[model samples]
Target: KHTVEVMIPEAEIKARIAELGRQITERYKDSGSDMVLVGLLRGSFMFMADLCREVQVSHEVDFMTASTRDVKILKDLDEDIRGKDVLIVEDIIDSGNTLSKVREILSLREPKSLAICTLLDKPSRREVNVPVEFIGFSIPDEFVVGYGIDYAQRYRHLPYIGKVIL
Candidate 1:
């Protein structure tokens, strides 16, 4: 049998995602201009539904995929964001090594403004400072999965977050 030890509850996850969206909308109240939100494939998929709806302000959602030579990204953004406010949605604020590339490429396109919204962070490992704007929560070092987290390559209909032991 498999044992699942949940840490971050579903309610907290739901509350935070909406709260994060609120903060983003408020921040853009004055600076907003053709606002766009970008997320990486798979992980940010499920979370965006609620996050997108709560924004109140006008916005668009888009996603892309990236990995290594750790090489080229499999997919990229569709719309032109050069003159708009760009926001990056992340499942996790990783070590910042790979994350920097995504930002730089988006930077090269020269979006009018840029920011980040993340579900989790491990402050212990970040290599440098970055444009971390909105966030859902901070988490420990563990194999927490589900609800936009696909560590098992499996999908679930409800919110599930935590550790696993088998």
Candidate 2:
């Protein structure tokens, strides 16, 4: 069995997401374009779902799963993104390795613009300086799980984010 403690409450999470949604809505309003919200799988699914509804804009969504050992895309996008605005929605960004790889891959696809949006950011553990245009929260370097993030695939269904106590 594993023990965990709440780091961010469910209410707080909802509030921040709503705020982010409003920001995204405003940013893309007059851009005269639609967006493709790309989510990184396993961890980002739930966050992506919530965010998509929040960002009141005309957009399509897609998912890509990167292998844990390396930032290789195990699953690819269904829609072509060429000349489209892209926003990578992520549950959390820790080392920035995987996001770095995703950005590199998407950049070559010829999208008109690309940006990153994440619910949680752990700058203390960053290995690369990944640029994020939208951020919900900045957290410390702790083992986090819950709200679609996990430890050994558990705790992902929890309503709020938590810290795993070893």
Candidate 3:
């Protein structure tokens, strides 16, 4: 069996995030419009908070927790999302199952625009076509934890993505 690994380091994570903020800020400035940031709850919270402050522009912030209906996400989205330009912040795009369901629900609102910004992209494991507008890293498929990514809903405060042992 294959094992997980520390594909990204702490310093690398910080530098990449700063770079992402610069690029995002430039994009918004070019469009000449303020943008709102919508974070996918739980996983994307830390990243979203950091990204928002880095943008250096006046903006709105919102959040939603999305999971399969059989799971527990729909109830979360029921709280908000109506006629807004949404940037769905996510920690990782793994199966695309959760993200797919989320996009479907949000699309019904007819927002000005909708896009994704994930910190990690495991395209090798993605089974659906979830378009990612911004990405920090594209890593090989591995069960990783840290920097807000979790295993068994733990290790979110590690400050760096690291290998997880089962």
Candidate 4:
């Protein structure tokens, strides 16, 4: 069993998500083409769902899985992303290795534009410089779980983010 302390309350989380949605909507207002939201698998599931719901613009959704070890694509997008504005959504960014690799892989596909949005960022752990255009929170290097983030596939069901104590 693990003891945890809430880092962000549920109400706060909801409010921030709504704000992000509004921001995203405003940013894509003038784009003539349909936008795509690419969610990283497993970890980003809940964040992507909430964010996509908040975005007011017409958009498409896709998912990708990348190897943390080498950034190889474990899964691919369902639709052609070329010529579209692609936004990569993530639950959290730590170490920045996998996200950087994923970004590089997606960039080679020649999308009209590519950007990143993450719910949490731990810049101190970054191993590679990755672009993160939208972020919900910047956190210290702590063992965080909940809000679709997990440890050993547990704690992801929690409604708010927390720091785990063993």
Top model number, lDDT: 2
> How many clashes does each candidate structure show, in the order listed?
1, 0, 1, 0
Stretches of model 1 off by over 4 angstroms after superposition = 155-158
Any idea how many clashes model 1 has? 1
TM per prediction: 0.90, 0.96, 0.85, 0.96
lDDT of 2: 0.91
What shift in Å separates residue 48 of candidate 2 from its native position after superposition?
0.7
Per-model root-mean-square deviation over C-alphas = 1.9, 1.3, 3.0, 1.2
Per-residue CA lDDT of candidate 2, range 1-166, in tens? 6699999999999999999999999988777776899999889999998899999889999998887476777899999989898999999988899898899999999998999999999998999899999999999998999999989868989999999997
Model 1: how far residue 153 lies from native, Å = 0.8
* Structural RMSD, model 1: 1.9
lDDT of 1 by residue, 1-166 (tens): 5666776888988888778877887888787578888987768877777688778778878888878256468899988889889888877776766567888889888899988888878777788677788878777767667777765675334486766666
Candidate 3 lDDT trough over 10 residues, lowest sum: 70-79
For candidate 4, lDDT tens digit of each residue in 75-155? 888998889999999999998888888888889989888999999999999988888999998999989999889888889
lDDT of 1 at 107: 89
Worst 10 residues of 1 by lDDT: 149-158
Model 3 alpha-carbon miss at residue 38, Å: 1.1
